[PDB]
Amino acid sequence: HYIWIDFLVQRFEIAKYCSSDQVEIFSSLLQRSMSLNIGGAKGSMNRHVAAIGPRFKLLTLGLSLLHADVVPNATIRNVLREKIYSTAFDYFSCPPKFPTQGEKRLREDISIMIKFWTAMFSDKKYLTAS
Amino acid sequence: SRGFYFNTVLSLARSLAVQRPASLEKVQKLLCMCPVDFHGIFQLDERRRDAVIALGIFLIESDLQHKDCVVPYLLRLLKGLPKVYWVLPVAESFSFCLVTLLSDVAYRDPSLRDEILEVLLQVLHVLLGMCQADKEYLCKYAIPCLIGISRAFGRYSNMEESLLSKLFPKIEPEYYFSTISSSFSYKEFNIPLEMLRELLNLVKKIVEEAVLKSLDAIVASVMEANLYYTSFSDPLYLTMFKMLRDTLYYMKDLPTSFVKEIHDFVLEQFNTSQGELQKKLRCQANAACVDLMVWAVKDEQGAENLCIKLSEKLQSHLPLLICCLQGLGRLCERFPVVVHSVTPSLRDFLVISPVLVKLYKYEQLRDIAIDNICRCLKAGLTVDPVIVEAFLASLSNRLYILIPDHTIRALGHIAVALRDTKVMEPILQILQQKFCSPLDVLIIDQLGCLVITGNQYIYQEVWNLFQQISVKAYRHCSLAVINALANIAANIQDEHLVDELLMNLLELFVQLGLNLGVLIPVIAVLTRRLPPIKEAKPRLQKLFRDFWLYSVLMGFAV
Amino acid sequence: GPLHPWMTLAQIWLHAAEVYIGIGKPAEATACTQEAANLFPMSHNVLYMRGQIAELRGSMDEARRWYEEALAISPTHVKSMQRLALILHQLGRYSLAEKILRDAVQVNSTAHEVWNGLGEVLQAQGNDAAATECFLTALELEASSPAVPFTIIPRVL
């Protein structure tokens, strides 16, 4: 699952300008993987530490799609952002623990986390959702 | 707004017919959806009617595949009709539809003609026994079914698609289900003569008046016992006469005995019925009889007698006189001898019509009369090459002596009718010498239609006349001439004339530069009919350059 | 207190609007649905009826927006997807309509309108035998169709 997201990101970057129908396919794919059920044992996503890479990579891809200014209406963006925040809050509902992987496969996770933090910080784009 | 069930059944029938060959299991399924016979008694509902109509439309498109199975069931259905129990009415419409489908199938395959006509004869015998012989059911359903089946006796169409297919499209049809006795309008089926004789027997029996009185009496008994129809005399009379005209309208190659007995029938009916209303819908029946009787004439003296009898009535009901004009035109076309005799009869009415005067205080009869006049004159010039010269001399004399409007319309129509044919030159001379008052408005309108004829000299003459008129600027004709030019530009089919018109218009526009904003719409209309230009004579380039120079000088592009 | 009376009133108003829309009086239906939307403004039924009245008006652009908006809330709805597929078929595209029909037949397999639309969209593809069998299935399904779904009756011990 760590490479399929990279392929999807490359294809989305390629098809952002030319086509206008693949964006709908990407939106439909991104909508059916997430759910707003932050709670005990229902989130459709694993909450182990060793699976934080693809999760935040997909979240960053969704944020990049939202920032692309492609969806015309002002109603899909609200639902997508609400789902993004709801699935982001889910990871912090478990007792903290420590990573189990080796020295490698850890640096890129920190890089992804920092990049996602910056992308989250860059949302002062609000005030016109109506 | 047929609905869902009917629409989806029709769509399924359409989709299945295109698949050739069609599997038999689907045919069995649709037959199961169709009703079945139970002890010679039949009931019906909307769904079964829709299913059998879908079967009928499927049969035609399927190229008559597996007809040996569906056809016998259709025969059983049509022979079991009189005892059908039921839950404008619907029975007559259903009878119309089924008889139309039957006629289509009969036209498609000649091998079933004999059995089809014999079952027609048997059901006709059954209904004849029904009529002259229990009462509420008879009046409610038997008579409307007879009307429906008679309304679509044998009319067909030698076209690529079926007549019934036009009734139900794949999205006029509602017109037929709202009238009383409306209908539609090479093979000439090998129909036996005894069929014609027994059909004549049917017709002469059913036109009895005592049976009509008895029908009225039983209808009144039904009325007082307590429904769509009120009086069956006029509708049945008109329907039977109309179907009598339609069935024998086109059939040919008949010996003299049948023709003369039919002529005696129609003439005696004319004498009896017509000579009594000289104190409503009977006029249509009389007109149909008149249309049928002219077809049964094979002598010149009889044609002359008919012409005299019609002419004495003309110079004094509207459909009667319309059909009189139609029959006179047809007879003049058939016999070119009486062309000179009937010419004064048609001319006098037009040149002198109090009924039209009262109507004014409307034009269909006028144009029909003009077309019949043109047909008469073309028939006359077919045999005699001097009769048209005599007629034009007479018309010139009449012009010399609000009749000018009719005269100019007649002149325009005869000029249009004689486009192909040492005949156009006298008309050209007459129109040149007839110039000169608001009567000039339609003169150039008639002249515009003459441009389509496609003669270089005529085009030069008319263009020079228009140029002189424009340079002169009868100030009221300024809009008329530009309107005529706009009409002309959309009705030119000669490329040489098109380019010549373009060059002439450009030259006129550049000349007048030494009020000019009304000349561009015609340029746009003419130029939208041509592909983009790449290269041509440098004269065109210079004209375009001068045109754009004047356009930028006047700032029109701004 | 409880939201049940409010939903009963909303259902009454929506039924009245649906009755009105079947006769050709768009203004009255629009007024009724606007009054009904005052209580719950972002339900799916109100969006569906707004799309319906917009389509009946004669504009085929707002209806697509309303149908997509309704689909964005309840992905399991059927009538909205069927209407969107039908309105997209006549436009010319034959790709998204097939996927929508497949999803509709996957979620439910008891609607004859879905089969009719699938056969109609397949009629333009070439496989006429499959269209014929789909029409047969749609017709045989309609023979046992009630006025309202039987699931409305509660099932409680």
mmCIF file of C-alpha atoms in Angstrom, chain B residues 55-277:
data_model
loop_
_atom_site.group_PDB
_atom_site.id
_atom_site.type_symbol
_atom_site.label_atom_id
_atom_site.label_comp_id
_atom_site.label_asym_id
_atom_site.label_seq_id
_atom_site.Cartn_x
_atom_site.Cartn_y
_atom_site.Cartn_z
ATOM 1 C CA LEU B 55 -47.512 -8.140 -31.345
ATOM 2 C CA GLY B 56 -48.961 -6.397 -34.394
ATOM 3 C CA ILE B 57 -46.182 -3.823 -34.631
ATOM 4 C CA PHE B 58 -43.566 -6.543 -34.031
ATOM 5 C CA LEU B 59 -44.992 -8.659 -36.859
ATOM 6 C CA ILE B 60 -44.447 -6.029 -39.565
ATOM 7 C CA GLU B 61 -40.845 -5.178 -38.669
ATOM 8 C CA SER B 62 -39.923 -8.857 -38.177
ATOM 9 C CA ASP B 63 -40.230 -9.412 -41.975
ATOM 10 C CA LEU B 64 -43.232 -11.716 -41.423
ATOM 11 C CA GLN B 65 -41.169 -14.344 -39.605
ATOM 12 C CA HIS B 66 -43.114 -17.201 -37.984
ATOM 13 C CA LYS B 67 -46.355 -15.863 -39.458
ATOM 14 C CA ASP B 68 -47.788 -19.394 -39.690
ATOM 15 C CA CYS B 69 -48.311 -19.361 -35.899
ATOM 16 C CA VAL B 70 -49.507 -15.814 -35.176
ATOM 17 C CA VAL B 71 -51.809 -15.510 -38.208
ATOM 18 C CA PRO B 72 -54.304 -18.303 -37.297
ATOM 19 C CA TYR B 73 -54.736 -16.794 -33.833
ATOM 20 C CA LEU B 74 -55.446 -13.441 -35.492
ATOM 21 C CA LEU B 75 -58.064 -15.156 -37.667
ATOM 22 C CA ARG B 76 -59.676 -16.668 -34.567
ATOM 23 C CA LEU B 77 -59.637 -13.282 -32.819
ATOM 24 C CA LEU B 78 -61.292 -11.479 -35.726
ATOM 25 C CA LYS B 79 -63.919 -14.193 -36.219
ATOM 26 C CA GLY B 80 -64.693 -14.320 -32.482
ATOM 27 C CA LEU B 81 -65.227 -10.556 -32.254
ATOM 28 C CA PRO B 82 -69.070 -10.330 -32.100
ATOM 29 C CA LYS B 83 -69.277 -12.247 -28.794
ATOM 30 C CA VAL B 84 -66.440 -10.370 -27.055
ATOM 31 C CA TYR B 85 -67.358 -9.198 -23.552
ATOM 32 C CA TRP B 86 -66.159 -5.742 -22.515
ATOM 33 C CA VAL B 87 -65.194 -4.486 -19.061
ATOM 34 C CA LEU B 88 -65.294 8.056 -28.719
ATOM 35 C CA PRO B 89 -65.399 4.457 -27.471
ATOM 36 C CA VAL B 90 -62.492 2.004 -27.612
ATOM 37 C CA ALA B 91 -64.024 -0.847 -29.655
ATOM 38 C CA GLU B 92 -64.075 1.088 -32.934
ATOM 39 C CA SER B 93 -60.490 2.287 -32.442
ATOM 40 C CA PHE B 94 -59.346 -1.272 -31.742
ATOM 41 C CA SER B 95 -61.205 -2.520 -34.821
ATOM 42 C CA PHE B 96 -59.546 0.211 -36.895
ATOM 43 C CA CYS B 97 -56.098 -0.783 -35.623
ATOM 44 C CA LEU B 98 -56.575 -4.516 -36.175
ATOM 45 C CA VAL B 99 -58.081 -4.097 -39.652
ATOM 46 C CA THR B 100 -55.238 -1.745 -40.614
ATOM 47 C CA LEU B 101 -52.694 -4.341 -39.473
ATOM 48 C CA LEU B 102 -54.607 -7.024 -41.386
ATOM 49 C CA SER B 103 -54.543 -4.903 -44.549
ATOM 50 C CA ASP B 104 -50.801 -4.321 -44.126
ATOM 51 C CA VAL B 105 -50.183 -8.066 -43.783
ATOM 52 C CA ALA B 106 -52.410 -8.737 -46.800
ATOM 53 C CA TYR B 107 -50.380 -6.276 -48.874
ATOM 54 C CA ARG B 108 -47.088 -7.797 -47.699
ATOM 55 C CA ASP B 109 -47.858 -11.372 -48.813
ATOM 56 C CA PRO B 110 -50.236 -12.166 -51.715
ATOM 57 C CA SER B 111 -50.528 -15.849 -50.735
ATOM 58 C CA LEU B 112 -52.958 -15.064 -47.883
ATOM 59 C CA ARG B 113 -55.201 -12.738 -49.917
ATOM 60 C CA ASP B 114 -57.888 -15.338 -50.654
ATOM 61 C CA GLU B 115 -58.257 -16.558 -47.065
ATOM 62 C CA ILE B 116 -58.116 -12.975 -45.779
ATOM 63 C CA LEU B 117 -60.898 -11.826 -48.106
ATOM 64 C CA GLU B 118 -62.984 -14.919 -47.354
ATOM 65 C CA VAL B 119 -62.814 -14.310 -43.601
ATOM 66 C CA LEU B 120 -63.702 -10.682 -44.371
ATOM 67 C CA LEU B 121 -66.746 -11.987 -46.244
ATOM 68 C CA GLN B 122 -67.712 -14.306 -43.376
ATOM 69 C CA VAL B 123 -67.523 -11.591 -40.715
ATOM 70 C CA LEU B 124 -69.466 -9.275 -43.052
ATOM 71 C CA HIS B 125 -72.171 -11.946 -43.375
ATOM 72 C CA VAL B 126 -72.238 -12.306 -39.581
ATOM 73 C CA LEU B 127 -72.677 -8.567 -39.005
ATOM 74 C CA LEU B 128 -75.289 -8.328 -41.781
ATOM 75 C CA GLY B 129 -77.257 -11.060 -40.029
ATOM 76 C CA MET B 130 -76.728 -9.145 -36.785
ATOM 77 C CA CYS B 131 -78.057 -5.814 -38.061
ATOM 78 C CA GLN B 132 -81.297 -6.915 -39.743
ATOM 79 C CA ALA B 133 -82.296 -9.378 -36.996
ATOM 80 C CA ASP B 134 -79.508 -8.351 -27.934
ATOM 81 C CA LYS B 135 -80.275 -4.644 -28.365
ATOM 82 C CA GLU B 136 -78.339 -2.712 -25.707
ATOM 83 C CA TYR B 137 -75.145 -4.658 -26.424
ATOM 84 C CA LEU B 138 -75.748 -4.393 -30.178
ATOM 85 C CA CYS B 139 -76.166 -0.611 -30.116
ATOM 86 C CA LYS B 140 -73.316 -0.116 -27.644
ATOM 87 C CA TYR B 141 -70.646 -2.179 -29.376
ATOM 88 C CA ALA B 142 -71.723 -3.842 -32.639
ATOM 89 C CA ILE B 143 -72.471 -0.639 -34.568
ATOM 90 C CA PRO B 144 -69.277 1.206 -33.469
ATOM 91 C CA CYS B 145 -67.221 -1.844 -34.449
ATOM 92 C CA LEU B 146 -68.896 -1.858 -37.868
ATOM 93 C CA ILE B 147 -68.065 1.837 -38.262
ATOM 94 C CA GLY B 148 -64.457 1.201 -37.256
ATOM 95 C CA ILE B 149 -63.925 -1.733 -39.607
ATOM 96 C CA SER B 150 -65.590 0.142 -42.480
ATOM 97 C CA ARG B 151 -63.439 3.224 -41.836
ATOM 98 C CA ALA B 152 -60.263 1.259 -42.725
ATOM 99 C CA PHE B 153 -61.550 -1.282 -45.258
ATOM 100 C CA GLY B 154 -58.592 -1.705 -47.601
ATOM 101 C CA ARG B 155 -56.519 1.474 -47.585
ATOM 102 C CA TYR B 156 -52.779 0.782 -47.623
ATOM 103 C CA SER B 157 -49.532 2.461 -48.668
ATOM 104 C CA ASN B 158 -46.774 1.336 -51.042
ATOM 105 C CA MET B 159 -44.105 2.894 -48.833
ATOM 106 C CA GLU B 160 -40.898 1.715 -47.190
ATOM 107 C CA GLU B 161 -42.483 1.718 -43.714
ATOM 108 C CA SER B 162 -45.868 0.429 -42.609
ATOM 109 C CA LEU B 163 -48.907 2.679 -42.334
ATOM 110 C CA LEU B 164 -49.499 1.526 -38.752
ATOM 111 C CA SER B 165 -45.852 2.228 -37.883
ATOM 112 C CA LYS B 166 -46.503 5.906 -38.615
ATOM 113 C CA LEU B 167 -49.413 5.815 -36.152
ATOM 114 C CA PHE B 168 -47.105 4.823 -33.266
ATOM 115 C CA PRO B 169 -43.723 6.588 -33.562
ATOM 116 C CA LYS B 170 -40.468 5.886 -31.701
ATOM 117 C CA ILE B 171 -40.316 9.056 -29.590
ATOM 118 C CA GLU B 172 -51.226 13.479 -36.382
ATOM 119 C CA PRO B 173 -51.866 10.190 -34.498
ATOM 120 C CA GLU B 174 -54.257 11.917 -32.081
ATOM 121 C CA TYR B 175 -56.158 13.445 -35.018
ATOM 122 C CA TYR B 176 -57.622 10.096 -36.094
ATOM 123 C CA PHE B 177 -58.854 9.184 -32.596
ATOM 124 C CA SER B 178 -60.864 12.436 -32.407
ATOM 125 C CA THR B 179 -62.651 12.624 -35.787
ATOM 126 C CA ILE B 180 -65.790 10.797 -36.980
ATOM 127 C CA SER B 181 -64.954 9.109 -40.306
ATOM 128 C CA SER B 182 -61.400 10.168 -41.138
ATOM 129 C CA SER B 183 -58.915 7.885 -42.889
ATOM 130 C CA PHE B 184 -55.729 7.976 -44.975
ATOM 131 C CA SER B 185 -55.883 9.642 -48.407
ATOM 132 C CA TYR B 186 -49.274 -0.255 -58.363
ATOM 133 C CA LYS B 187 -50.019 -3.842 -57.361
ATOM 134 C CA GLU B 188 -53.811 -3.723 -57.894
ATOM 135 C CA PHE B 189 -54.425 -7.035 -56.133
ATOM 136 C CA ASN B 190 -55.891 -9.862 -58.203
ATOM 137 C CA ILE B 191 -59.281 -9.514 -56.508
ATOM 138 C CA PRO B 192 -61.985 -11.734 -58.058
ATOM 139 C CA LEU B 193 -65.002 -10.235 -59.804
ATOM 140 C CA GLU B 194 -67.577 -12.097 -57.696
ATOM 141 C CA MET B 195 -66.107 -10.237 -54.717
ATOM 142 C CA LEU B 196 -66.888 -6.945 -56.467
ATOM 143 C CA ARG B 197 -70.430 -8.096 -57.263
ATOM 144 C CA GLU B 198 -71.180 -9.263 -53.716
ATOM 145 C CA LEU B 199 -69.634 -6.053 -52.351
ATOM 146 C CA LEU B 200 -72.024 -4.106 -54.579
ATOM 147 C CA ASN B 201 -74.813 -6.243 -53.111
ATOM 148 C CA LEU B 202 -73.646 -5.309 -49.605
ATOM 149 C CA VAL B 203 -73.548 -1.612 -50.495
ATOM 150 C CA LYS B 204 -76.985 -1.575 -52.126
ATOM 151 C CA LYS B 205 -78.519 -3.445 -49.186
ATOM 152 C CA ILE B 206 -76.968 -1.306 -46.432
ATOM 153 C CA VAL B 207 -78.060 1.999 -48.007
ATOM 154 C CA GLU B 208 -81.683 1.171 -47.232
ATOM 155 C CA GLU B 209 -83.574 3.854 -45.337
ATOM 156 C CA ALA B 210 -86.124 1.656 -43.515
ATOM 157 C CA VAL B 211 -83.332 -0.123 -41.641
ATOM 158 C CA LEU B 212 -82.084 3.332 -40.652
ATOM 159 C CA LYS B 213 -85.543 4.262 -39.337
ATOM 160 C CA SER B 214 -85.689 1.003 -37.364
ATOM 161 C CA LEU B 215 -82.226 1.733 -35.959
ATOM 162 C CA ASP B 216 -83.447 5.174 -34.886
ATOM 163 C CA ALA B 217 -86.509 3.613 -33.230
ATOM 164 C CA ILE B 218 -84.461 1.068 -31.277
ATOM 165 C CA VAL B 219 -82.032 3.871 -30.369
ATOM 166 C CA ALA B 220 -84.944 5.865 -28.929
ATOM 167 C CA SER B 221 -86.067 2.756 -27.042
ATOM 168 C CA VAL B 222 -82.554 2.580 -25.572
ATOM 169 C CA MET B 223 -82.686 6.299 -24.712
ATOM 170 C CA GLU B 224 -85.976 5.903 -22.848
ATOM 171 C CA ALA B 225 -84.753 2.707 -21.163
ATOM 172 C CA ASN B 226 -82.324 4.708 -19.005
ATOM 173 C CA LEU B 227 -73.394 6.550 -24.852
ATOM 174 C CA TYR B 228 -71.652 8.567 -27.572
ATOM 175 C CA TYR B 229 -73.704 8.486 -30.783
ATOM 176 C CA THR B 230 -77.150 10.081 -31.012
ATOM 177 C CA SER B 231 -78.321 9.647 -34.625
ATOM 178 C CA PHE B 232 -76.790 6.941 -36.816
ATOM 179 C CA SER B 233 -78.344 8.012 -40.139
ATOM 180 C CA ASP B 234 -75.896 10.702 -41.279
ATOM 181 C CA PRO B 235 -72.683 9.150 -39.833
ATOM 182 C CA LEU B 236 -73.356 5.699 -41.307
ATOM 183 C CA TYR B 237 -74.481 7.199 -44.628
ATOM 184 C CA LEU B 238 -71.366 9.367 -44.940
ATOM 185 C CA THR B 239 -69.025 6.579 -43.817
ATOM 186 C CA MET B 240 -70.469 4.055 -46.272
ATOM 187 C CA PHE B 241 -70.338 6.483 -49.196
ATOM 188 C CA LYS B 242 -66.773 7.501 -48.300
ATOM 189 C CA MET B 243 -65.590 3.891 -48.124
ATOM 190 C CA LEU B 244 -67.431 3.145 -51.380
ATOM 191 C CA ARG B 245 -65.492 5.950 -53.061
ATOM 192 C CA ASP B 246 -62.175 4.936 -51.482
ATOM 193 C CA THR B 247 -62.385 1.209 -52.266
ATOM 194 C CA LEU B 248 -63.122 1.709 -55.978
ATOM 195 C CA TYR B 249 -61.207 4.982 -56.392
ATOM 196 C CA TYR B 250 -57.971 3.501 -57.765
ATOM 197 C CA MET B 251 -58.976 0.103 -59.186
ATOM 198 C CA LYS B 252 -58.645 -0.124 -62.974
ATOM 199 C CA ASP B 253 -59.172 -2.587 -65.842
ATOM 200 C CA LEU B 254 -62.906 -3.169 -65.437
ATOM 201 C CA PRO B 255 -65.258 -4.105 -68.310
ATOM 202 C CA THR B 256 -68.082 -1.772 -69.235
ATOM 203 C CA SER B 257 -70.918 -3.567 -67.409
ATOM 204 C CA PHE B 258 -69.623 -2.937 -63.884
ATOM 205 C CA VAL B 259 -68.681 0.649 -64.746
ATOM 206 C CA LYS B 260 -72.113 1.420 -66.194
ATOM 207 C CA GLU B 261 -74.015 -0.159 -63.298
ATOM 208 C CA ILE B 262 -71.883 1.776 -60.797
ATOM 209 C CA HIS B 263 -72.562 4.924 -62.830
ATOM 210 C CA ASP B 264 -76.304 4.230 -62.692
ATOM 211 C CA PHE B 265 -76.004 3.723 -58.927
ATOM 212 C CA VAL B 266 -74.184 7.014 -58.376
ATOM 213 C CA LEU B 267 -76.415 9.027 -60.725
ATOM 214 C CA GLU B 268 -79.633 7.716 -59.170
ATOM 215 C CA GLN B 269 -78.285 8.445 -55.684
ATOM 216 C CA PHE B 270 -77.367 11.958 -56.847
ATOM 217 C CA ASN B 271 -80.836 12.564 -58.297
ATOM 218 C CA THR B 272 -82.655 11.209 -55.239
ATOM 219 C CA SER B 273 -80.609 12.718 -52.406
ATOM 220 C CA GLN B 274 -79.539 16.048 -53.911
ATOM 221 C CA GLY B 275 -82.987 17.079 -55.147
ATOM 222 C CA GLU B 276 -84.404 17.244 -51.616
ATOM 223 C CA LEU B 277 -82.288 19.768 -49.644
#
